[PDB]
Structures are given as C-alpha cells and as structure tokens.
C-alpha cells in the first residue's frame, strides 16, 4: 500500500536520481 | 549507531462527535502505518529493538520515523537500501541518527 510506490510517472528512474533534482 | 531516521515519511494532510471520530481514524491510520513500516523493517533489514513514529511540529501533519535495530550492521545497511526506495509516491530520505 505504501512501500515502493513511485511518484506518478517516475517509475523509470531511481529514488536517488529523483532526490538529486530536489532543491 | 543502531538507530536510523526516515525523514518526514509520515504524512497526514486533511463537532464533539466529529472530534471523537477524527481521533479514532487518526489512531487507526497511525497504527496501520506503524505496522506497515515495522513489518518491513523486520522482514527485510533485521530485528527491531525500538521504533516510533513522531509528530514533528505537534500538528500531526508530518513526522519522522525512528527505528532502533538490535544490530548496528542492520541499521547501516537499511539506510543504504532505503535511500534507494520509494514510499507512498515519494523517495525515502534515510539517515543514521546518532
């Protein structure tokens, strides 16, 4: 229900690559 | 350290009888969340000694999760793997907490 549910549309990149863009 | 912190992972955005109903649902949502995280901690990373879901500002809106593993090793490995995982549509922000 919670675990490993990616942000909509970002299942194809890793959490680390997603976090790298956060600022 | 044997303790890890999952930063702002616990989210929760939005009379008299309404208050009571609200208390119950929050509590049940809290317990569901807790079990959800606890089980995974023990299932994939190791034995949990202590765990708590916090209320950062006291508004029940956002909270960190702290998990104290029995083994320092499990903790260090959990942090690395958890930082490579999603949780509820957001990336996890894991960190060893001195």
Swiss-Prot record, chain A:
Disulfide bond annotation, renumbered to this chain: none
Domain of life: Eukaryota
Subcellular location: Nucleus
Subunit structure: Interacts with U2AF1L4. Heterodimer with U2AF1. Binds unphosphorylated SF1. Interacts with SCAF11 and SNW1. Interacts with ZRSR2/U2AF1-RS2. Interacts with RBM17. Interacts with PRPF19; the interaction is direct. Interacts with POLR2A (via the C-terminal domain); recruits PRPF19 and the Prp19 complex to the pre-mRNA. Interacts with KHDC4 (Isoform 2). Interacts with ZRSR2. Interacts with the SF3B complex composed of SF3B1, SF3B2, SF3B3, SF3B4, SF3B5, SF3B6 and PHF5A.
Task performed by this protein: Plays a role in pre-mRNA splicing and 3'-end processing. By recruiting PRPF19 and the PRP19C/Prp19 complex/NTC/Nineteen complex to the RNA polymerase II C-terminal domain (CTD), and thereby pre-mRNA, may couple transcription to splicing. Induces cardiac troponin-T (TNNT2) pre-mRNA exon inclusion in muscle. Regulates the TNNT2 exon 5 inclusion through competition with MBNL1. Binds preferentially to a single-stranded structure within the polypyrimidine tract of TNNT2 intron 4 during spliceosome assembly.
Disease: Developmental delay, dysmorphic facies, and brain anomalies: An autosomal dominant disorder characterized by global developmental delay with intellectual disability and speech delay, epilepsy, hypotonia, short stature, microcephaly, intermittent exotropia, and non-specific facial dysmorphism. Brain imaging shows a thin corpus callosum and/or delayed myelination.
Family named by the database record: Belongs to the splicing factor SR family.
Full protein name: Splicing factor U2AF 65 kDa subunit
Species annotation: Homo sapiens (Human)
Gene this chain is encoded by: U2AF2
Residues of the full protein shown: 90 to 112 of 475
Curated annotation (Swiss-Prot), chain B:
Residue span, RRM domain: 17-98
Residues the record lists as Phosphoserine modifications: 97
Superkingdom of origin organism: Eukaryota
Cystines in this chain: none
Protein function: Plays a critical role in both constitutive and enhancer-dependent splicing by mediating protein-protein interactions and protein-RNA interactions required for accurate 3'-splice site selection. Recruits U2 snRNP to the branch point. Directly mediates interactions between U2AF2 and proteins bound to the enhancers and thus may function as a bridge between U2AF2 and the enhancer complex to recruit it to the adjacent intron.
Subunit structure: Identified in the spliceosome C complex. Heterodimer with U2AF2. Interacts (via RS domain) with PHF5A (via N-terminus). Interacts with ZRANB2. Interacts with SDE2. Interacts with SF3B1.
Notes concerning its domains: The C-terminal SR-rich domain is required for interactions with SR proteins and the splicing regulators TRA and TRA2, and the N-terminal domain is required for formation of the U2AF1/U2AF2 heterodimer.
Disease: Myelodysplastic syndrome: A heterogeneous group of closely related clonal hematopoietic disorders. All are characterized by a hypercellular or hypocellular bone marrow with impaired morphology and maturation, dysplasia of the myeloid, megakaryocytic and/or erythroid lineages, and peripheral blood cytopenias resulting from ineffective blood cell production.
Protein name in the entry: Splicing factor U2AF 35 kDa subunit
UniProt gene name: U2AF1
Parent-protein start and end of this portion: 43 to 146 of 240
């Amino acid at each position: 229900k919670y675990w490993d549910v990616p942000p909509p549309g970002f299942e194809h990149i890793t959490p680390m690559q997603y976090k790298a863009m956060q600022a | 350290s044997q303790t890890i912190a999952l930063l702002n992972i616990y989210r929760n955005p939005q009379d008299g009888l309404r208050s009571a109903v609200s208390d119950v649902e929050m509590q049940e949502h809290y317990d569901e969340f807790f079990e959800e995280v606890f089980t995974e901690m023990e299932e994939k990373y190791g034995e949990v000694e202590e765990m708590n879901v916090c209320d950062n500002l006291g508004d029940h809106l956002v909270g960190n999760v702290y998990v104290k593993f029995r083994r320092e090793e499990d903790a260090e490995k959990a942090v690395i793997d958890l930082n490579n995982r999603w949780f509820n549509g957001q990336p996890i922000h894991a960190e060893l907490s001195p």
